[PDB]
Amino acid sequence: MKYVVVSGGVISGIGKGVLASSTGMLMKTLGLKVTSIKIDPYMNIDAGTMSPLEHGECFVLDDGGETDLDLGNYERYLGVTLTKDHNITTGKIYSHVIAKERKGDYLGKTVQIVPHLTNAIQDWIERVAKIPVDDTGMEPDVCIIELGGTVGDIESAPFVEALRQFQFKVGKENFALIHVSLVPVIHGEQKTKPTQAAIKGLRSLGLVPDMIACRCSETLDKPTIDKIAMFCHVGPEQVVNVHDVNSTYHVPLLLLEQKMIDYLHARLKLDEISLTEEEKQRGLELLSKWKATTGNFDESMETVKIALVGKYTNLKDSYLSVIKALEHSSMKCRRKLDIKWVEATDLEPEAQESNKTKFHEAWNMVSTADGILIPGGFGVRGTEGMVLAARWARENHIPFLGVCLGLQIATIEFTRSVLGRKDSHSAEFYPDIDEKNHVVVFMMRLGLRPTFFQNETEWSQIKKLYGDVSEVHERHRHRYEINPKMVDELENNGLIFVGKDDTGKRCEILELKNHPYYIATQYHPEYTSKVLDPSKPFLGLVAASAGILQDVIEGKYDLEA
Amino acid sequence: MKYVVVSGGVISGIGKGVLASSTGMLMKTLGLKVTSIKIDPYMNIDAGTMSPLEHGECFVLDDGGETDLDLGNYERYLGVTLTKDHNITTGKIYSHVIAKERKGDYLGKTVQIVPHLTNAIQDWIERVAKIPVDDTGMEPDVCIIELGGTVGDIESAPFVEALRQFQFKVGKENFALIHVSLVPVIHGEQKTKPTQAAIKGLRSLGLVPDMIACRCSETLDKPTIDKIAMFCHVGPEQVVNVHDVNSTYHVPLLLLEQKMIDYLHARLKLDEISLTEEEKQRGLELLSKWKATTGNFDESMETVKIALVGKYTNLKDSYLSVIKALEHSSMKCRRKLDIKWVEATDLEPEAQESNKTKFHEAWNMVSTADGILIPGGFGVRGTEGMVLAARWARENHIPFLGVCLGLQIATIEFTRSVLGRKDSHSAEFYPDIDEKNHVVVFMMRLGLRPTFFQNETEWSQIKKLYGDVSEVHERHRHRYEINPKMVDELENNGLIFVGKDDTGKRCEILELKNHPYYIATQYHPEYTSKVLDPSKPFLGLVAASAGILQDVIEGKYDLEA
Amino acid sequence: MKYVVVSGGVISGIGKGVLASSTGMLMKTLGLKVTSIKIDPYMNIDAGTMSPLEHGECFVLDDGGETDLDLGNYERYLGVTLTKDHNITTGKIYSHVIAKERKGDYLGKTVQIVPHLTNAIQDWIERVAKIPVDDTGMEPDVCIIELGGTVGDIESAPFVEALRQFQFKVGKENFALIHVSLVPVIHGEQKTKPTQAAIKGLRSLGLVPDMIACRCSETLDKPTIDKIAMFCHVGPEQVVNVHDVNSTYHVPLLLLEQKMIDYLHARLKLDEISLTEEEKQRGLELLSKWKATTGNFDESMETVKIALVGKYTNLKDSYLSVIKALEHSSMKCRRKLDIKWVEATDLEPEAQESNKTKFHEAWNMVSTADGILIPGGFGVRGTEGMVLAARWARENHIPFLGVCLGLQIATIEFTRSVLGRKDSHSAEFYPDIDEKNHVVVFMMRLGLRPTFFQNETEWSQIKKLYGDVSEVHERHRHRYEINPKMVDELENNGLIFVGKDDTGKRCEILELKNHPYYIATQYHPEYTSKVLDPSKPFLGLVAASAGILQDVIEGKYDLEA
Ligand SMILES: Nc1ccn([C@@H]2O[C@H](COP(=O)(O)OP(=O)(O)OP(=O)(O)O)[C@@H](O)[C@H]2O)c(=O)n1
Ligand SMILES: Nc1ccn([C@@H]2O[C@H](COP(=O)(O)OP(=O)(O)OP(=O)(O)O)[C@@H](O)[C@H]2O)c(=O)n1
Ligand SMILES: Nc1ccn([C@@H]2O[C@H](COP(=O)(O)OP(=O)(O)OP(=O)(O)O)[C@@H](O)[C@H]2O)c(=O)n1
Ligand SMILES: Nc1ccn([C@@H]2O[C@H](COP(=O)(O)OP(=O)(O)OP(=O)(O)O)[C@@H](O)[C@H]2O)c(=O)n1
Ligand SMILES: Nc1ccn([C@@H]2O[C@H](COP(=O)(O)OP(=O)(O)OP(=O)(O)O)[C@@H](O)[C@H]2O)c(=O)n1
Ligand SMILES: Nc1ccn([C@@H]2O[C@H](COP(=O)(O)OP(=O)(O)OP(=O)(O)O)[C@@H](O)[C@H]2O)c(=O)n1
């Protein structure tokens, strides 16, 4: 096996993940089977305790674990299904060694941070790097290891020990390191010294960088590259630079044009992977398809405006997957994405006396947008405004997607306005009883579950985007579903539930009959959107906002003929 | 409250504990209420998993937890009952913060090594420093904090962060630090540089030493003190030196004569503790009694030779408490202690053909000794030789003490030789059934439990040493007890069980009627031996080995008239 | 005596000098006698070898040494005459200890970087801090020590050793340190970690900061101050911040409003300086006069445009003193300064075919400007264009100042256009002989020398600005003077030499009779411009460019009535 560490810097937030999965997207250009592990220095075992206000969105796996949010950036860049084990955390590894301590697996020795815990970290990395995350069941050929925090933190010290020892447990010419570092510009001059002091830190703990990659406000000057390479064990051609680019999807082409892979090919001696012709071809095809979606961003002539309406939209990382799912789809439509961020509570009739100015800004965004999106918010607060946003797109033929709480609110609105029933509400308003629009179903429902189309719904816009396939597989995070008692009334009035579960009891998709595009999903489709294969419910929202939905379904926008 | 850190060095094993509890023994000379915490960098939560072969003896508390062995050094030096919480460990504190993470006590924040875990360590130190470990229920006035490992270890990095922040959570003029450091002598010259490089390390993590204390092969030269104080923020009078001394019990007088406390009095402004006259007097009396037991070591004219017979006596830390209990008692008898270490298996009739040379060395030790001691060994291996050592002291009137497995073997031997019954054995040889000398009693029996003298046994040598008090309280670690069915036969033959438990079902002490000193205890009395109050079963063993037992009971050897 | 170090950062160029002399300007607000030392890590002994292209202008002392350029920033901020010894450099101190090594002043000991060279640095700082640099001959009360480079450089390591030892040779409560450090803003967030890593570096070498001062793109957030003070031994009120301000002369008011001195008053216990009432008053008056010149910058309604015409004006530090002399004077005139930078060679008739575009930009600047300034350039290259700039201001009544080479070119032009004599040139064109406008006078003439007005010249605009005083004292740097043989012809034609030397042989000032303001000086007056007392030849240039020269001479712009 081969491995690539991405680590480093004098600051957290320097740029690692885009240098990480982006480096891993280019390993796939070579035809390689590829995987990724994110090592987190924080002490949470999982994001299941972490509220979406800090550390952001609880990204959800095929295996239904609430992971680190960043893992998602690797399932889009590489096109892989990761697992709950690919997110190493400081709380996860202290728990695993402490479990073995009380089980007595150390044969009554004292157990130490070195060597026992640093062995555990190496034994975890080489365990997880066997798992076949890729489009065929063979073990990966390269693993990208991203070390979070900064080298020299008292929180990241166990992992730089474990990785140093791993440079020997794995060989040189099988392991390499990319160190990401700061070139601050002050008084209009690029200063090298934070890279010198952080490389002094790096060699102290015993890792040696095979590349340096700079966060800089500028293109690095020719002398700045020379004054970094005069102070580190790299040639001047391995001081990489992730400068300003037209969009984040260009970074793997930027790295490839900086000859980043033409070094890693030699430095990891990748002629030693015995690839079949099918893999070598599928590598070149993935690069061609990347050049196509990238070209479709530069060659983008016209804007699509989408209002994303939810709780606390100020906290923009809390909707990160939703944004990326809209970006992947917008490059298929060749159209520039313009998300309007609406706080759902600013739409309310009460907000007009309380905070009038922001209420007009919110309603201008809703009134301007070519599509509406209710994104699967957290808790009840935003609900009353999200109802009026769903009403706005039901009545006037605006394209719409509701995700999770958005299906809940598409159904509450269609109840509250098409059936009358003005008292109806989420099951969250428990003591109203008779008018609850939803029912509890704890089984929380999580992870990849199937969904099956109802066999008559040949008219459906959404089941056309899925290619007329009989079923789909999707991620879930819900404790409530629409009350089955009401569903015949909603189906008879035209809110047709075009997809249900294995039992047929659970409401998984709705489409409103004879509207240009009004969909909701109980699942979160943004947790399976990929840059070359956009998630179908979000592709339909952008394509109908562009007024091109028919031609996207007919195939006028696939990447290769 | 006031606090004293003891930390440091370029090596583990430099001398901390003797500089720690020894500094704490002198805080008690001032009359202060005193406590101690040992911070261990290892990842075991407790010594209950740790086999006695590495990290040594599982020291046992009043509260019955299997602690770090070193805690014992503080219960002898200070005269305090500690608790399972006074041994902070890296595995204990990661477990406590990870428990709060899954309970959700962090209110859905991400939880970090800084500030959350470094707050947990400070909140633990100031929690535990409230506990009244001393001879009256008031909270301690000084806490001695010993930081294990070395500063600059990747295992000790969380604790030097937590202690730095603690220098502010507690004030300066309430916290002080003693750093213990190496002065190697090579080519006959004292080199200062390992102290310079380790003090550079110390100030990097942000602690500042109020004293330096040197491990050195010599008295520090006047220039060595000056060349350390020219490189650290200490006066030349605060470079302390724990040099070679007549015995370890002299170290608090060495520190006091080096004016170590005459600085800490000012540096911790200890006039601010409002002591009552009773405390001030009991402080001076504790110093006088220390000068007495110390004088009784220098003024020691004659040797007592004791054979300690057990499994794997090569592993001398595995019997550490037993050695210290013999030392405390030997200073009461004014006699020099000479422990002969015997491997119990080398006494066996089989060892004579297998390894004849070591078998003669073992038997010469048994034949020479003025007393025999079977120390409460681990597992079955040594048993056959320990029987012959108990027989040797039953028949010939040699003084004897059996501790735990030693009472078991005193009873197996008295069965195997006085009752005949040559097939009898420990309950460990389970499938013999009918001839098992013991019975299972899991309740493992642990911690401080009472023991009550049988009301007729006024003749007893051991219940005389306990001052004719009605009951005693002692530590236990046993899964087996002598089978109650047999005890009438043993009592009638003269192996009188002079002490039993609350129920009267359990065999806690035996004394053989009409022998000069042949005792065993099911408890481990070495876990309550103190330097001014020696544990009575061990005092009797030394005093009878000295042939002075009568006069020790009559009071010819108490420290003050 | 008291002392203040200014040091630090993860980068060179962070802001030290403005935090240094600015802190020293506020020590003078307290009435204190004040001095400054700049410690340079570079190996040049003096700027006399350093070409003005790199490290910039060779600033010149009262004592005529070619110093570090930065010393000037302290002679403006404090109002002091420094000496060649106030610029400590790595080349200067290795030379001084190596001289004592060959003289044998070490009594045949081996001489070491510690302690001998670190003693030399301390013995230099306390030597120089005695020198009476101030407006009365008493020794200074505070010394500001600026440590150049960054802490943790292999070039600055001898000085952080010497300063650590100096924290003891001088007492605490006599020495304090200000550490200047970076808060980079990326992704719109202020990151603290470069300050944590550089403070870890600082405490390693053993200095402790009594203040931190941040270079930041922003006002520091309340949490950024707290997260620095949680990681350093400073209160949150001693994390100072030199943010963006209207001009550099506001920084001492910014520091004073951040309560910077209200701490240093206590931290250096400055009630212990026994000031007389005259000093206490002159302190408050200096603050009032600073508030006045600062107010005159904010209250500045109208611009003055000045063309500064010379060689290589792209290298803007090479003219630094000239810029500051124009700034000090512009605040007296209440007018906003706008220096147009002209490359002198772009004015040439040859430049019109060679590089036409830049030639028009150069001539637009010359044609726009309200005043012309020829700044005392280095070498011959620019001369031909500087002639045409002097002609432009002779003929059309534009205000003019020529400094050094500018007097040379004022005289070459007046010769070349008023006397005819079109072949005349600088003595630099040696082999023309008969038409050389100048003569060699090596004595190089350097340092503070007098100049005496010619006793009839009561009409003079410049000798009016000097207050009708009989003589002036000024800095020089010249190897050529105007040929005395010609001076009668120039005086008779109206280029009156209104000032000459002690002998009357040397051409020190000229004024053209009956022009609104056309001055030149052979000396460099910008080496004695101060912020409260602007250098008179530059005050006249700004005031005549403003058309207000009469009223400045009559006194309509002095700071206090
Ligand atoms: N392939 C990627 C990589 C990053 N991002 C986005 O960029 C931001 C985070 O970038 P990252 O690469 O993780 O840098 P930071 O986290 O800011 O810093 P670090 O280097 O510490 O990860 C987030 O919006 C993340 O979703 C993304 O959309 N796609
Ligand atoms: N010396 C330190 C300081 C912090 N941490 C931990 O590592 C993380 C790094 O986060 P970082 O972005 O460094 O936060 P700050 O320390 O505030 O750094 P910044 O100021 O850039 O946020 C911290 O959250 C904390 O978990 C650490 O290990 N060692
Ligand atoms: N009051 C004390 C202190 C120490 N010792 C003994 O000395 C040895 C350990 O000494 P210690 O002070 O702990 O030093 P080390 O552990 O060798 O090193 P460190 O400084 O790391 O603790 C053990 O036999 C311990 O029982 C003792 O008998 N009584
Ligand atoms: N931090 C230090 C200390 C000393 N030196 C210099 O390097 C030499 C090393 O000599 P050394 O043997 O280290 O002398 P000491 O510092 O006293 O070390 P030791 O105590 O082993 O003599 C010193 O003489 C002094 O010249 C140095 O460069 N850096
Ligand atoms: N009282 C001052 C201080 C500084 N400057 C100007 O500001 C620049 C240099 O600022 P300085 O304070 O020296 O910062 P740097 O040299 O950039 O960085 P350092 O902190 O390393 O000195 C130069 O134009 C210098 O003349 C000035 O005009 N007046
Ligand atoms: N590790 C180093 C590197 C350089 N220097 C010296 O200290 C000076 C600091 O200048 P600096 O501004 O740090 O130059 P760079 O090293 O290039 O840093 P920058 O990239 O910010 O210019 C250097 O010129 C060199 O004299 C040093 O002492 N130690």
Residue numbers in the entry:
A (entry chain V), B (entry chain F), C (entry chain D): 1 to 443, 455 to 572
Published text:
CTP synthase (CTPS) catalyzes the final, rate-limiting step of de novo CTP biosynthesis (Lieberman, 1956). Each CTPS monomer consists of a glutaminase domain and an amido-ligase domain connected by an alpha helical linker. Glutamine hydrolysis in the glutaminase domain produces ammonia which is transferred through a channel into the amido-ligase domain, where it is ligated to UTP to form CTP in an ATP-dependent process. Budding yeast have two CTPS isoforms, Ura7 and Ura8, which share 78 % identical residues.
We solved filament structures of both Ura7 and Ura8 in substrate- (ATP and UTP) and product- (CTP) bound states. Ura7 filaments reached lower resolutions, 7.3 Å (substrates) and 3.7 Å (products), but the overall structures were indistinguishable from Ura8 at these resolutions. Because of their higher resolution which enabled building of atomic models, we focus subsequent structural interpretation on the Ura8 filaments. Like other previously reported structures of human, Drosophila, and E. coli CTPS, the yeast enzyme assembles as stacked tetramers. However, it does so using a completely different interaction interface, which was the same in both substrate- and product-bound yeast structures. Helix 356–370 in the glutaminase domain mediates interactions between tetramers, so that each protomer is involved in assembly contacts. His360 interacts with D370 which would be stabilized by protonation of His360 at low pH, and likely explains the pH-sensitivity of the assembly interaction. Residues painted similar (yellow) and different (red) from Ura8. In addition, Ura7 assembles with the W363/W392 hydrophobic core shown in Figure 3.
